């Protein structure tokens, strides 16, 4: 896929004490047009893993189909082994790199959030096969607009509670709405904890426009 058609904007991820939180707006943009305004860009992989994708939405739907089938097959085996978030992240890295090496990339940037064995997992996979782990993540323009705020907070406070992490993610979504021309003020927040994956939405940031009188 050299030319992405319908694309999603930044996806945010943040580790906290006891889980991971991921945020993504519900917009499928067709170039500059906001064509699709009620699409979920977060998928639940299994009870321990969730995924959010920026970029081509058809490629994301393809990946959702393939991953869902893999999880179904493993659950069919019924042998007491399930894919960890780390295993999903590794498989995604391999798939993206294989597509890149055939010069037929999947035009996506993925954030993988997970909670397994008392441990949080946050992983980034881009369309070239660049993959890494970090305590906070942001794709696209979020990398320039949300990641500095997340990093500043994590600098002064490495371990966040769930409430603090959610508030921080809300502030970052508000900044992205202010400054990214491909964003929308209707987003979802997915949280993975010991209890599993929960996806909340649609949600809106509280915006301020008083500078318009200045």
């Amino acid at each position: 896929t050299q030319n992405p058609m319908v694309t999603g904007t930044s996806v945010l991820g943040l580790k906290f004490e006891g889980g991971v939180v991921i945020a993504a707006d519900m917009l499928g943009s067709y170039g500059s047009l906001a064509r699709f305004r009620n699409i979920s860009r977060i998928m639940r992989v299994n009870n321990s893993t969730m995924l959010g994708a920026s970029g081509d939405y058809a490629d994301f739907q393809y990946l959702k189909q393939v991953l869902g089938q893999m999880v179904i097959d493993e659950e069919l085996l019924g042998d007491g082994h399930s894919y960890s978030p780390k295993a999903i992240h590794s498989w995604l890295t391999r798939a993206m790199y294989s597509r890149r090496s055939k010069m037929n990339p999947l035009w996506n940037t993925m954030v993988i959030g997970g909670y397994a064995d008392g441990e949080s997992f946050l992983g980034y996979v881009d369309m070239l096969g660049v993959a890494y782990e970090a305590p906070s993540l942001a794709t696209g323009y979020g990398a320039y607009l949300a990641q500095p705020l997340l990093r500043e907070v994590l600098e002064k406070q490495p371990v966040l509670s769930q409430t603090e992490a959610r508030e921080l993610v809300e502030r970052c979504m508000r900044v992205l709405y202010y400054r990214d021309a491909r964003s929308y003020n209707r987003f979802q927040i997915a949280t993975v904890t010991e209890k599993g994956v929960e996806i909340e939405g649609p949600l809106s940031a509280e915006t301020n426009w008083d500078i318009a009188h200045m």
Binding site: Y97, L128, V130, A131, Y132
Partner: peptide, 8 residues
């Protein structure tokens, strides 16, 4: 260099 190549 290119990190994808380094991992692979």
């Amino acid at each position: 260099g290119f990190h994808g190549d380094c991992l692979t």
